[PDB]
Amino acid sequence: DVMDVMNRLILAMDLMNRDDALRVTGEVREYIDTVKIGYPLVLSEGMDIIAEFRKRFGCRIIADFKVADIPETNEKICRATFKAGADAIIVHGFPGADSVRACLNVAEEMGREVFLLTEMSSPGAEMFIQGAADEIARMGVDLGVKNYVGPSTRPERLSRLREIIGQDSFLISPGVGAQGGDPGETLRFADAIIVGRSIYLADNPAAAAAGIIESIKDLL
Amino acid sequence: DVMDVMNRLILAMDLMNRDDALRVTGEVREYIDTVKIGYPLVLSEGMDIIAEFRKRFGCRIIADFKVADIPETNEKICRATFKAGADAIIVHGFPGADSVRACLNVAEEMGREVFLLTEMSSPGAEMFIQGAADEIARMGVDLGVKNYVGPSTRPERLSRLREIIGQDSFLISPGVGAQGGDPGETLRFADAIIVGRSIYLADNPAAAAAGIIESIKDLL
Ligand SMILES: O=c1cc(O)n([C@@H]2O[C@H](COP(=O)(O)O)[C@@H](O)[C@H]2O)c(=O)[nH]1
Ligand SMILES: O=c1cc(O)n([C@@H]2O[C@H](COP(=O)(O)O)[C@@H](O)[C@H]2O)c(=O)[nH]1
Known part of the structure; x- marks a missing residue:
């Protein structure tokens, strides 16, 4: 009845240019099927980036827009x-x-x-x-x-x-890695962890993702 | 000092297509030099809508993005x-x-x-x-x-x-007009009022803006 997230791991793709965001996401694609896209990427590269991620990766997309307006405006934001x-x-x-x-x-x-x-x-x-x-x-x-x-x-x-x-x-x-949260402890309570910088700023993002998954392998 | 808002009136331009948004903003240009652009328009037309407004009207632009994320992401949103x-x-x-x-x-x-x-x-x-x-x-x-x-x-x-x-x-x-707020009463405390639907959904947005301004004439 719930969303099924591969490896209980959601990539927070907060790089702000299309080439880097696409490249890094591609590098870790074998490990994930769910990408969180927020305003850093959307306001830098446009809302068309979402359809492009779907075309390239066939991943599900969570729009992290922290919607926080009046009802009428919230409706418009959700529709767009x-x-x-x-x-x-x-x-x-x-x-x-x-x-x-x-x-x-x-x-x-x-x-x-x-x-x-x-x-x-x-x-x-x-x-x-x-x-x-x-x-x-x-x-x-x-x-x-x-x-x-x-x-x-x-x-x-x-x-x-x-x-x-x-x-x-x-x-x-979210808050796993860079902000100090531990992947395994977080998965005691959460269905999935959101990870941004620990993966996308890594020298080797694929190795970073693989390492996180190794640390929680008995929780998968 | 503070920004000098013409007629103490800020247009909330929450139409969601470029053509209508540009038309209505142009129609009220003689009354308003300050435009609030939010996510309904930006997520529909892209951040380049800001450039287009600056080119067409030279109005000041307030980005109503209700920024509400962690410090690191807030920085990125503001930079973009x-x-x-x-x-x-x-x-x-x-x-x-x-x-x-x-x-x-x-x-x-x-x-x-x-x-x-x-x-x-x-x-x-x-x-x-x-x-x-x-x-x-x-x-x-x-x-x-x-x-x-x-x-x-x-x-x-x-x-x-x-x-x-x-x-x-x-x-x-904001909240003047459609949401029930009164322009004159609001200006007892606010430097400027934000007005969206009362103007942008009017048959004649210019007449609507002129009417609001006439009601607050002694406060200008
Ligand atoms: O409470 C919250 C809610 C969030 O959406 N986030 C988001 O989750 C991501 C965390 O990324 P990172 O792993 O680089 O710290 C960022 O996109 C951030 O905006 C957060 O950090 N804390
Ligand atoms: O408390 C608030 C803060 C706002 O930014 N707004 C914004 O001000 C505008 C109000 O528009 P309107 O005049 O159509 O009600 C909208 O863009 C809305 O998102 C608001 O209505 N209430």
Whole structure:
């Protein structure tokens, strides 16, 4: 019933030029079937990059756009994003339920998925988001959200998120590697890990990906 | 000093195709020298839409990207956005001080401006954002933020935001027209109002803009 991510590993492709992004993704293609594409790449190379990734790799694409506007604008963003061929979109929960529902409506209309971001992995998340995160997660459950994002850098917060959403929901988690999160510990709670710089800034991205997978091989 | 916004009126250009967006913006050019371009237009037409607006109208451009990621990704978003020619970018404060600081550092390096969004005008903002809003504003002031966005639909919140940031800071305010905010009342606190649908969906956008301006004539 959930998305099936090869090797429980999602590449965060945040390189900002097309040649490098395509080359690095190609180098690791044997290890993944799911790529997270965000604004660094999209605002540098255009939304057409999504269709190009599908043409070259036949990977699923999660548009990490941290959608965080009013309902009317969220609807337009989701429509433009899914028109470009994204399979899923990541939406902030902090702006409230109506803004999430606007995204859920468009995803249902176009055959796509919404991922609800509940607590972020960066230190500043402790200031405002963390105190609201359990409530944001319960809001997700109330709204029928099935896909969530929570922080590798705080395994106790990631475990709590898993507790709230249940074992049947799908949970992906960034902050692995460069931000300090451990792949194996994160996969105790998340279905899949998101990895960016540890792979795409590596001297040998293929070896970097292979190494991460080796470290979690008994979890696959 | 602050940006000199003609008629205290900023167009929210959220049409999603180049031809309509260009037509409507040209139609109101005599009334407005400041245009807010967001993701509905950018994700539909590309970042080169900024260049096209600068070429056709010479209007100032505020990139309404509600930047809301970790510091490292925020930096990349700001760099790409200013590279494309945006005068300013709008940033969420709820992800915390580090994420805002990342944007400020890029804006300082590149000679551009950050606007901090503290609370939103839509109903769901009451769930989580509102209760953090005074503190998000105070954080902005502590970080040296000079430009702010606050909600016309909540006068008590907009007035408190103005108090916190002081009279010298620059404050712009959406939610006027379609969302119910009143132009004159909003300008008691905001330096400028942001107006989208009331203008861009009008049979005659020029007449719509002229009508808004006539209603606030004594405030100019
Ligand atoms: O809380 C979050 C949510 C994210 O989407 N991300 C995203 O996940 C990726 C993490 O990449 P990296 O492995 O290079 O730290 C980035 O694209 C970032 O924007 C994050 O780091 N923390
Ligand atoms: O709190 C906020 C912050 C915004 O940027 N906006 C933006 O301001 C514009 C409002 O447009 P309109 O006048 O059509 O309601 C939209 O682009 C929206 O994304 C808002 O409505 N409320």
